[PDB]
Structure formats: structure tokens, C-alpha cells
Design a protein around this nucleic acid. Structure first.
Lengths: 68, 141, 206, 8, 142, 140, 100, 62, 48, 84, 72
RNA sequence: GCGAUAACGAACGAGACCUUAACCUACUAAAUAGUGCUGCUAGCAUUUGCUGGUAUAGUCACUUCUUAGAGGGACUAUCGAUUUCAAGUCGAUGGAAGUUUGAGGCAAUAACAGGUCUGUGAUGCCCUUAGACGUUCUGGGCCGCACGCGCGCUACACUGACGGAGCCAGCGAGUAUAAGCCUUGGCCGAGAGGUCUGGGAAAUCUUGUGAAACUCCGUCGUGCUGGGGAUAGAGCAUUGUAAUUGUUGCUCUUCAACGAGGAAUUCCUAGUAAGCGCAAGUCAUCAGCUUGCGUUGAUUACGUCCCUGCCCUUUGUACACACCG
């Protein structure tokens, strides 16, 4: 399965609560943005965090999300 | 166009060079060709007793043509096969050295081969001339 | 139709392949049709191939096997019983020769006979077991089109394999007889006895 | 495990 | 090409007190004679100028006598010593090739010659056990 | 020099490097014509990149490939990929890109492995068995 | 002028690449023509032992490794210049051999 | 007299070992008389699997 | 028959006339200590 | 050859020094609890993220036992155990 | 041990071959063995000549399989 | 993980991580890698072409393939369905890669009378300690054979055996005054092997490890047959102080059961299974064994708790040394 874990789910939603105006619905822009916002030790975790932040951003535009 | 050895199928080129090389008759055939096995891994002598030596020399000449200074030890590896060890698994075993060494020696004094520098046996100035000739006379039919 | 002159000469017959892609450059897929509505989507003959050897990835997803060419699925099932695993070129040689024998016999399109033998060999109802922890119990259930197709190939090659065992008749011409007989629905062929015996038992369980 | 007995 | 003959085929041959099926190919028909394997039968046929494409019954008497002569006298027909069955014989030291009835006689004579001196190999032959050092713990079950 | 593009195709271990120069319809395998590539029964695997587009595409180009590594079957698939990729790479550089997109369409619509190398590689062997997943037979 | 070869071997690449770059650096500001560094195919020294000191348990194996990385640098300079470059880039992990 | 029934809904895996599937079939002709039947092989929706006998429903297998 | 070599050729292998034994398996409370020296709580208290 | 002797900067961060120091205390008859906590607190005092001491063997009892004396935060799996 | 296929060609079988083989949809090594009761080796030599005599047309050539048909 | 929620917010383990495999005509270079050109040179058609050889000075060019370091790339990306519209799942499209991208390494809280004191100059105690249970020398045994069982290797044939011919990998290892490493090439020898030189402390030489299955052309023709190669005789060499109880290799001869295997039972979901070989370890010699590697390459699910083991919840307990109670 492709179930993201808590280390990526909560760290991504901290980005939204902190940098929503600078975020966007594009993964490529988010991937570059999260490399200057957070200190991520590994590239693979960076892509996972940015890939879930984009999903949450794409979901906020469709209505209000619970917990963010 | 210029026909070469590389422009003709190997299987029917060797069948044509073997026939020519036998009818030409200058290749010296050792006296044990009716007795010996080609390889220690083989269990029977060749079924074409009269002609097997000529065809093998034709194969050796063509094989040396396409490469540069191949030795006789490499020829043993080339023609060797899987030995039929009874209950133990199969294994690769080299072919007989004398048969290959006699062939290259027979081909070297017929004018097709010579001792190459830094080992092996190159193909002769005339070795290209007569193989490329047979290739042309192989595919017109 | 024009003959194209290259520096490397190309044989006449292979230049004819520019017009049409044919199995072994001999058999056409154009005039081949499945005489059963329920197996059209699982017998793949729409994409022609030259040789039944594609080395594709049909085991990744669930129904990718339906996308493999039907002849390649047949030649895959020939290489069985240990000593033949991985010997696909030998299997392709058998299929290539079998089609020619199927052509000189009955004169039909050889791959049409292959398609006919497959629709006639898959059991339409098999009796699955519903045994309650050991006891013998059987219930008649329907057979999916995919299992119907691929059980036909399993039964056709198994019958050909056993007919060529300890027999002077070669495997390519045992397969040709097996495919031809099953194509016309004859009960003499294996995999038609089996198909009838499967559907006969299923009738005694519903 | 054995008791060495001499002969010579 | 296919050719026909009448009355020349011989269904059963008798060579060296051994019955030979006449419809077997000559190289493999002679292998019925004990002491003559495929490798040896292949060479005596080539030394006797008997082409291997003939069945056993196809051969005439002239060829049959020429073969049994060669098998009984291999060294006289340029057959190498190392190719022979019984070389460096125990008593006379000459190279021999024993055949159908002579083979079991000289095979026997080797057994008592081993048993007479009571060598270990001769002893194990008497017991009916394997003599070449094979383990008998788990496979000697016949 | 002249219009030359150099490419490569790959299968499991076999890799075939194709040199495509401007010339006549010369198509060689290790210095030998493609009409006699072995095994014979798979000769149409390398004929596919030719007959799919039409031999007229090869009038202006000559192709010489050097295939090493892999096995007998794996080398055939490497060659047909090098030819298909070599023809496309030549069109992209010396012909309009409309034709290159045309050539890529027929090839891709027929077989993905003509242009895209198969990524399957052999799984490593693990101890406790004679294979990658196979294990020694267990007894009770 | 002298065609001089410098061979660099070590187990760890960080110090190896520092020495390799440092030698190339000194061969740049000094107008010395150079060829390299050449990354030689790394050697995997593998030893596969049994985990168990005894012979009981599941048959589990360790697979130890020792990667050896090799770089060769070709220099065209007098022998005095090349040797002093070696002392400039001396590193405990990386060993240096100089061949003309 | 075989009848063909396109499947329109895969209900779920049934049977003891899960080797048989409940499916919702719809007849090709007379697009009504929708029936629940069990099938052995792998099944997607839109399978034209034919029925030797039609007048029988299906329930869970033991 | 003083030497073993001489007697071996005279001893016959009479092995196929006698039948093998019907069973031949000849190779248990591991939890219960058999040392007979129990440990008192004082010893554990003093040590640990 | 030339040999130089250098003092370890952070004795609390060197498991070798702490194990040798602990051994020199256990061989002096000090109780395990007093000895184990002398390195647990010394490691933390030096600034260690975590420390764990395990002493196994037999002590005044025929049956043998092992006791672990952990402290702070410790990681167990993956590459970081080779780093920190 | 029931085969007992004929390996020597007499005169009765020879003309029977040339009178019966042409009236075959498909001839091969096994077909000749199966129905003419001749041996496999005799079948192989019979096919190589019958093609040279024009009675038989070679549909396909292979060492392990020989597919032949009538030439009429 | 979503969610439900007297819990809220966290830590270890899982996951992250590390090594390896797959992509990069995008960087960085490469005479220990390859190529195109260029010299010089050969053969065949003569069309200026096609195959080669040579060039550590042609004191050329380049990095595509090859090597390896710095990076980039995938995050289930986009779009459809279902879902508590959540976590997700299933389909497509693009993609080198969409099964945790493939494979491993590491791996929690306690613990086991699990296995080893026959790995340790790791160890407590007991036994022995000069006619030794220490150490060494000689010879034998560990192989011994009415039997039961397990891990495997050959096979029962024609999808095959031989006989010729075609002719393709990857992982690795390699020495000096030794106590002898990998060993080409030439010459003898049917072979095994012998002999003379040289290269390589290694991307350079062994080595393109020209491996085996495999493919083509022939013989065989359903026959315990040219399937199978036990058992045994004679002979020829190799290693070693030493081959007998055949170390092993080679030649001829001997031609056994086995004609697909009962009750049972093992491993396995994609470059996987199955074949097929090769290297390294042990190693003076010996691989039907392991550790890896590559060649050919599928059938069938992609589901369930029916059997089996384990985990969780409820439940009973007179057990807690915990049902071996």
C-alpha cells in the first residue's frame, strides 16, 4: 500500500498552517519551496512531504479540511 | 559489390569450403582421423569419418578469419562441450588439442595461416584471398 | 508494392511484410474471428505479430494476460514438464510447424483453427467444491471468460503433450491433430472429453 | 571416558 | 535412394557364438557381442571397409569373416594398443582384446588371482560388497 | 563530418551500439548483413523496425551495430531496439520533427520495447535457497 | 618534462576525492598539463561467513564488504614538482605511489 | 440453449477458500431478469459469460 | 585362521537370510530443575 | 614509527573509557547498582543524548541473570545507530 | 515390443509406396511409419527420393519435422 | 492511517535510514574503456565501396556505449470511478521507473534451562597432570553394512539421444628465493597430461574466462533402443612423504534398477518458479555442498480464513516453578 505515515502527514500540515500563502497546487513548485522552508535530511522524505502537502492543498481548494 | 566471409551464412559456407578443400586435396590428413574422438567430453567419433577433418579445418579457417591471432588452446575451448558425467552434473571440457593443432599446422603449410606476432595464428595474405573467393562462389546459386 | 532497393539487399518475401504483418510471414489475422461473443475480449487477435515471441510483461497486473497474443499464450503453455521450462524457441518452432500441418489439413486458416479449438475447449460450468472442512461437497458454478480461455490452452497443450509421449508422432503434428479435432468439436480429441466431462458433472450438481 | 590399561 | 533386394537379407546372424539381429545397423548390431562396445564396433567396421549404412543382414559372408578376423586380431590392423580391452596382460604382458566367451573367463581368472593372494580387493569380491571404496551404509540395499 | 547519430539499445545484459550515418541502405550486424542474423526463428524481431515504417526510410542512412553481452535471445532484442532508436534519433537531428513524431508513433503503437528498454533485471539470490525466492525444501 | 603517474587508493571516497581534487588543483595554477583523475572500477572485497560461532540455528550468513577505490593521475612535470605535491595532499586514509 | 449474461456488479468473494465470486449478471437480450450468480475464474465487470441454465439464483457457498 | 586376511576369504556373508529389526529408533522435563540446589531470596537479595 | 598519547576530551562520551572505568569499579567490589548509576549519571552529565548499561553474569546465585540500566533517549534500528 | 516396423524394402512394398503415398493429404516421417508400417529410417530415405521423383511437394523443410504434401 | 473517542500530546519498534539494481546523448574526466577520423596497410567488386589488421606517438577528436562522483528524477504525478468522500483502493495516460519502484542490511520491550566451555592466551568449579586425559611420532578409524529416514544429483526419452556446425554472459581470484598463484603462446600426446618461454601483485595478463542449455544440418525410429550409466576388469597420468579401503583425471571393455512414481509432503506470484551453466569458500588433490553470478524463461491467483501457525479481543481458572501446572 501507499499509506503515508505520521512523520509526513503532520509535518506537511504544519507547512500549510505556516506557509499557506506561499504554497500552491503544483508539486514541482512545492518540492522546491519545501527545500527552502524545512531542513529535510533526505531527498526521498522531501518529495513525500511535498507530495502530501500538494494533496492537502488540492483538497483545501475543494472545501474546508478537518484539522488544518 | 565485394563478397566477404561475413556476407555468407556460416553453416553453408563451411559446407562449401569443406567440399572445396577436400577436392583440392593438398590438405594433409593425419592417419588417426578414423580412430580419434574430437573431444574427451565426446563419447563417439564423428559420424562422417571420411570428411569430418576437412570440415573442421574449414571451420577453423573461417573462425580464425574473423578474429586476430587465436591460439590452439582457445580452439579447444571453442569446440569443447558438456561432458556426460554419469551422476555428477555436466561440465565444460575442452576439445582435443592434437586435432586442432594438426588442423592449423595443415592450414599453415597449405598457405591459409601463419604464426602471428605475440602468439596465436593470423590468417595469411592468401588466406583472405581464397576464403573470400569461396564466399563469392557460395551464394551465386 | 514497389520493390525497394537497399545497399543491404532485403529478400523479396520480407519486403512483402510491408503491406501486412503476418504470423511467421505466412498467416493473416484479418480473416480471423471468434465464433463466441463471450470470449472476444479475452482472445487477443487484433494486434498482429510476426513471431509468437514478444517477451512482454503480462504478469504484472491482473488481466494483462488477455492482452498477450493468443498464439503466444499457446506457445507459452507448450514448454512444460521441467525439461522444457524456458525453452521458448523450441516451443515457437513447434507452433510454427503445427500451423503448417493445420494448413495442409482441412485447408483452413491455421490460426482460425487455433481460435476455434479454444472456444470449444473451455468448460462453461465447472463444479467447485464446497466441502466443510474435509467432507466431500461439490457445487456447480459458472466459469469466467478468462478462465474459460486459459483452461482451453491448458487442456489443449496437455493433450498434445501426452499424445506425443513415447510415440513416433512428433509433438508439432500431435498438436496439429489435437487442435484440428477440437476445432470441429470432435469428441475423439482430448480436452473435448475433459470439457464434456466437466460440464457433465456440473449438470449433476445444480 | 575409558581407563587406560597398560600391557607392556 | 530406396533400393530393393530379395533373399539376401539374413534375419538372424551368429557371430562369435552370439545371436545378432539382422535388422539392426551393423555398428550397433555388433555391440551385442560381449566385449565389443560402440566405440570398438565403430572402428572394426571402418577397418573392414564395411560402410556403416548397412543393416546386419545386408552384409555378405565375405564381409562377416573380414570383421571377425579384425576383432580377434586388432593390433594386426593398425588398431592402437591403448584402444584395446586387455592391455599389458598379467601373464604374457601383451596387448589383448577379449571377446564374447573369453571375456568372462579372463574376468574370472582375475578374481581368483586376486583371491588366491587374498588381497583386500579379492576378499571384498568374495563377500559380494562394493570393491572400489564406495560407501555401503545407505545405498547397498539391493 | 557527415550526418551521423550514435545510439544504443539494451536488454537484460545485452547492449547494441548503433552508428547511423548518411549513405545507402547498409544495415550490418557486427559487420555482417542483417538478413542472416541468428537464431533464424527470431529474425523477424529485427525485421520489425524495418517493415513497420517501410524500407524507404533507410535509403539515405546506413546502420552498423555492435552487440556484445547478454545472450542469444537478449542480443536480438537489443539490436531491434538500437535500430528503431537509431532511425528516430537520426530523424530528430537531420529531418523535421514531424516525421520523428510520426516514426515514434508506429513503433510505440506496435511494441513498447522498440523504444523503451525493458527495466527488468535479475533478482539477487538470498541464502537459505537456491534462488531469489526459492528456499531449500523443509522436512519434518 | 617527465610523464609521471600518480596512483591513489583508499577505502573511503571523501578523503580520496579531496586528495584527487587537491592534486588536480595544484596542477592547474601551475601550468602543468594533466590527464585525470581516472575513476578505476571499484573493487568489492566480499567475505561471507556464518553468523553462528557454533553450528546450531537457522543458516544465516553475514556478508562483509570492503570497497577499494582507485584513481590514477598523469602529470607532465619535473620530478621535484610532483613529489612535493604529494606532501601537500598527504592524508592518513589515502596512500600515494608515484611512478614515472 | 445457452444464454449470455453480461456482469454489471461484482458483489464480493464467496466460498470457503474465496475461489468463487458473487456477481450481478444482466442478460444480453431482454436487458432485465438480473440474477446473482457465482463464477469460478477471475471476473471484471462487462464479462459476457454464458449460462447453461438461467432459472436459478445463487447464495453463499460453504 | 590366525591372520585376518586368510580367514576373510573363508567367512561367508550371511546377511540376506536374517531380517532387519522392525524398529530401530534409539536416538524429559526440561522446565524442572534437576540440580537440587534451590536459590534462596537472601542470595538474590545480596547479589542483585 | 612515532607514538603519541592524547587525552580523550569527553570522558563521558567515550564508551571505552566508561567501560574500563566501570570494570575498575566492579573489580573493586562496589555494588552493581551503585556502579551502574555512576556511569549513567556521568554520561548524562557530559551531555549524552542517551546511555544504556547492561551487566550480565552470575552474582551470588547459581542461576545467572542480566539487568539493563537505561537512561535518556536511545535509537536502535537503521543507519543512525552507526553514526550516533 | 509390438512395433516390428519393416526396415528392408522388398518389391511388394516398393510399388505399394508409389501407389499409395500420392493419395495422401499430408505425408511425413510418422505418417509413413504409421500407415505404411515401414521404419523411421526407411521413411526418411523414402521422403527424400519421393520428392526428387516429383510425387511429393515440400511444404516445409526442417531436420526435426518434414511437412510434405501431394504434388498432384 | 482515517475515524470513533476520557483522553490529549509524545517516544521506541514499523516507516524513515544505509547498500545495491533500473533512467540521465544533462555535468566531470579517461593510452588500464570504447568509438569515429586519420597515417600505414591488407583481401573482394572495381563505383569513390565492403570487411579487416596495425598506430603506449597520427605526441588526432569525442564520451554515446564503459568506468565512477557530484547531482537530477517518483511524490502514487494527472485524469476517471468507488469510499464515512476520509485514510485508501481499483482503472487508465504520461513515464525508465506507479507490486513499499525491485532486493537486501539494520532492527523495540522484556525473555528461553534454545545451541555452543569441540573458535578463543573467554571463563568458575570438578577430573587428570609423567606409564598423562599434556605434546609428538607410526599405523588404523571417522567411509566400516541384514536395515528405517532426510538434504540432493542423474534419469526414465523423439519438446530426445548422439555427430558435426553456429556461438552468446555476469559475479570474482590471482606470486618472488618462494616452498610456489592465475597462467596465454609454441611444440609433443587419442586423451588426461608433459615440456620451453612470456604476461600479470592486475579495468592492462590469465580473460571477450568463445560456459551450458540454446540454434541449424545429419544419423537413430518407439526397442530397456544409439534412453540411463550404476557395478566391475585391464591400462595410462596427475597431486602428494605416502593413493592399498580404487583422491582425482583419461582410454577400452562390462550395460544393472529405472518405461513418470502409493499414503503423504516441500518451495513458489515476474525476469519470479523452473531449467542451464560459471566464479568464490573450503582446497597439495577432490564439489553430486554452500555463498553468489549471469543465460533461457513460463503456468496460475492477485483472493480467502476451509486446513496449519502465530497475534488480538471476550471468557473460565483451585495455575504464577505459570498445563512439562
Amino acid at each position: 500500500g501507499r499509506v503515508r505515515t505520521k512523520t509526513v502527514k503532520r509535518a506537511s500540515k504544519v507547512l500549510i498552517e505556516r506557509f499557506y500563502p506561499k504554497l500552491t497546487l503544483d508539486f514541482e513548485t512545492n518540492k522546491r519551496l519545501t527545500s527552502e522552508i524545512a531542513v529535510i535530511q533526505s531527498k526521498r522524505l522531501r518529495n513525500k512531504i511535498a507530495g502530501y502537502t500538494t494533496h492537502l492543498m488540492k483538497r483545501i481548494q475543494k472545501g474546508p479540511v478537518r484539522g488544518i | 559489390p565485394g563478397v566477404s566471409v561475413r556476407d555468407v551464412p556460416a553453416q553453408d559456407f563451411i559446407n562449401a569450403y569443406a567440399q572445396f578443400l577436400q577436392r583440392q586435396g593438398k590438405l594433409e590428413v593425419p592417419g588417426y582421423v578414423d580412430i580419434v574422438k574430437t573431444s574427451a567430453g565426446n563419447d563417439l567419433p564423428p559420424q562422417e569419418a571420411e570428411t569430418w577433418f576437412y570440415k573442421r579445418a574449414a571451420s577453423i579457417a573461417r573462425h580464425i578469419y574473423l578474429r586476430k591471432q587465436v591460439g590452439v588452446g582457445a580452439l579447444n575451448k571453442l569446440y569443447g562441450g558438456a561432458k556426460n558425467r554419469g551422476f555428477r552434473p555436466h561440465k565444460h571440457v575442452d576439445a582435443s588439442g592434437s586435432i586442432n593443432r594438426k588442423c592449423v599446422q595443415a592450414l599453415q603449410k597449405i598457405g591459409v595461416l601463419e604464426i602471428s606476432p605475440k602468439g596465436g595464428r593470423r590468417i595469411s595474405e592468401n588466406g583472405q584471398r581464397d576464403l573470400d573467393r569461396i564466399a563469392a562462389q557460395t551464394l551465386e546459386e | 508494392l514497389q520493390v525497394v532497393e537497399l545497399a543491404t539487399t532485403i529478400p523479396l518475401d520480407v519486403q512483402e511484410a510491408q503491406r501486412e504483418v503476418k504470423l511467421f510471414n505466412k498467416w493473416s489475422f484479418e480473416d480471423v474471428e471468434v465464433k463466441d461473443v463471450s470470449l472476444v475480449d479475452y482472445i487477443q487477435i487484433r494486434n498482429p505479430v510476426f513471431v509468437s515471441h514478444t517477451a512482454g510483461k503480462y504478469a504484472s497486473k491482473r488481466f494483462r494476460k488477455a492482452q498477450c497474443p493468443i498464439v503466444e499464450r499457446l506457445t507459452n503453455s507448450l514448454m512444460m514438464n521441467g525439461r522444457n521450462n524456458g525453452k521458448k524457441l523450441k516451443a515457437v518452432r513447434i507452433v510454427k510447424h503445427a500451423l503448417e500441418i493445420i494448413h495442409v489439413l482441412t485447408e483452413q486458416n491455421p490460426i482460425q483453427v487455433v481460435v476455434d479449438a479454444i472456444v470449444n475447449s473451455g468448460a462453461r460450468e465447472d463444479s467447485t467444491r464446497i466441502g466443510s472442512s474435509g467432507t466431500v461437497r461439490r457445487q456447480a458454478v459458472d466459469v469466467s471468460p478468462l478462465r474459460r480461455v486459459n483452461q482451453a490452452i491448458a487442456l489443449l497443450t496437455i493433450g498434445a503433450r501426452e499424445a506425443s509421449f513415447r510415440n513416433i508422432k512428433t509433438i508439432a503434428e500431435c498438436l496439429a491433430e489435437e487442435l484440428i479435432n477440437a476445432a470441429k468439436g470432435s469428441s475423439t480429441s482430448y480436452a473435448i472429453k475433459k470439457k464434456d466431462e466437466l460440464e457433465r458433472v456440473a449438470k449433476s450438481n445444480r | 571416558r575409558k581407563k587406560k590399561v597398560y600391557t607392556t | 535412394l530406396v533400393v530393393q533386394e530379395q533373399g539376401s537379407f539374413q534375419h538372424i546372424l551368429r557371430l562369435l557364438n552370439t545371436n545378432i539381429d539382422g535388422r539392426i545397423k551393423i555398428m550397433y548390431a555388433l555391440t551385442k557381442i560381449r566385449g565389443v562396445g560402440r566405440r570398438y564396433a565403430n572402428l572394426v567396421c571402418k577397418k573392414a571397409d564395411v560402410e556403416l549404412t548397412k543393416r546386419a543382414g545386408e552384409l555378405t559372408q565375405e564381409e562377416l569373416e573380414r570383421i571377425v578376423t579384425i576383432m580377434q586380431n586388432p593390433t594386426n590392423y593398425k588398431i592402437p594398443a591403448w584402444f584395446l580391452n586387455r592391455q599389458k596382460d598379467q601373464v604374457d604382458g601383451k596387448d589383448y582384446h577379449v571377446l564374447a566367451n573369453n571375456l568372462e573367463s579372463k574376468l574370472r581368472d582375475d578374481l581368483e588371482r586376486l583371491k588366491k593372494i587374498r588381497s583386500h580387493r579379492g576378499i571384498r569380491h568374495f563377500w559380494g560388497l562394493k570393491v572400489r571404496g564406495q560407501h555401503t551404509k545407505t545405498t547397498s540395499r539391493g | 563530418s557527415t550526418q551521423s547519430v550514435q545510439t544504443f539499445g539494451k536488454k537484460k545484459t545485452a547492449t547494441a551500439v548503433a552508428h547511423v550515418k548518411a549513405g545507402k541502405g547498409l544495415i550490418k550486424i557486427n559487420g555482417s548483413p542483417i538478413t542472416l542474423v541468428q537464431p533464424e526463428i527470431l529474425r523477424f524481431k529485427v525485421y520489425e523496425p524495418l517493415t513497420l515504417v517501410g524500407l524507404d526510410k533507410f535509403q539515405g542512412i546506413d546502420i552498423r551495430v555492435k552487440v556484445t553481452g547478454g545472450g542469444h535471445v537478449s542480443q536480438v532484442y537489443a539490436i531491434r531496439q538500437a535500430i528503431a532508436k537509431g532511425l528516430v534519433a537520426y530523424h530528430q537531428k537531420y529531418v523535421d520533427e514531424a516525421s520523428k513524431n510520426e516514426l515514434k508513433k508506429i513503433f510505440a503503437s506496435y511494441d513498447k520495447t522498440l523504444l523503451v528498454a525493458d527495466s527488468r533485471r535479475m533478482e539477487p539470490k538470498k541464502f537459505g535457497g537456491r534462488g531469489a525466492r526459492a528456499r531449500f525444501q523443509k522436512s519434518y | 618534462i617527465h610523464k609521471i603517474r600518480i596512483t591513489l587508493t583508499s577505502t573511503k571516497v571523501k578523503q580520496l576525492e579531496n586528495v584527487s581534487a587537491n592534486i588536480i588543483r595544484n596542477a592547474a595554477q601551475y601550468n602543468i598539463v594533466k590527464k585525470g583523475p581516472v575513476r578505476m572500477p571499484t573493487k568489492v572485497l566480499k567475505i561471507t561467513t556464518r553468523k553462528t560461532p557454533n553450528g546450531e540455528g537457522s543458516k544465516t550468513w553475514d556478508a562483509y564488504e570492503m570497497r577499494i577505490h582507485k584513481r590514477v593521475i598523469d602529470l607532465q612535470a619535473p620530478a621535484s614538482t610532483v613529489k612535493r605535491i604529494t606532501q601537500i595532499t598527504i592524508e592518513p586514509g589515502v596512500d600515494v605511489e608515484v611512478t614515472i | 440453449p445457452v444464454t449470455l449474461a453480461k456482469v454489471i456488479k461484482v458483489l464480493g468473494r464467496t466460498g470457503s477458500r474465496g475461489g468463487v465470486t458473487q456477481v450481478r449478471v444482466e442478460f444480453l437480450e431482454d436487458a432485465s431478469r438480473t440474477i446473482v450468480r457465482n463464477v469460478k475464474g477471475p471476473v471484471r465487470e462487462n464479462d459476457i459469460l454464458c449460462l447453461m441454465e438461467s432459472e436459478r439464483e445463487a447464495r453463499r457457498l460453504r | 585362521k590366525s591372520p585376518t586376511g586368510n580367514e576373510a576369504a573363508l567367512k561367508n556373508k550371511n546377511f540376506n537370510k536374517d531380517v532387519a529389526p522392525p524398529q530401530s529408533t534409539a536416538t524429559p522435563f526440561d522446565r524442572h530443575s534437576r540440580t537440587g540446589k534451590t536459590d534462596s531470596k537472601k542470595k538474590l537479595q545480596q547479589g542483585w | 614509527i612515532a607514538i603519541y598519547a592524547e587525552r580523550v576530551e569527553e570522558r563521558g562520551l567515550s564508551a571505552a573509557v566508561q567501560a574500563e572505568a566501570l570494570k575498575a569499579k566492579l573489580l573493586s567490589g562496589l555494588p552493581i547498582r551503585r556502579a551502574a548509576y555512576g556511569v549513567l549519571r556521568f554520561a548524562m552529565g557530559a551531555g549524552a543524548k542517551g546511555v544504556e548499561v547492561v551487566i550480565s553474569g552470575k552474582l551470588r546465585a547459581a542461576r545467572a541473570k542480566s539487568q539493563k540500566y537505561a537512561d535518556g533517549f536511545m535509537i536502535h534500528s537503521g543507519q543512525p545507530t552507526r553514526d550516533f | 515390443d509390438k512395433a516390428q516396423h519393416i526396415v528392408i524394402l522388398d518389391q511388394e512394398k516398393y510399388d505399394r509406396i508409389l501407389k499409395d503415398v500420392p493419395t495422401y493429404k499430408y505425408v511425413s516421417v510418422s505418417v509413413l511409419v504409421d500407415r505404411l508400417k515401414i521404419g523411421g529410417s526407411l521413411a526418411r530415405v523414402a521422403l527424400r527420393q519421393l520428392e526428387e521423383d516429383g510425387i511429393i511437394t515440400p511444404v516445409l523443410k526442417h531436420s526435426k519435422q518434414a511437412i510434405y504434401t501431394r504434388a498432384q
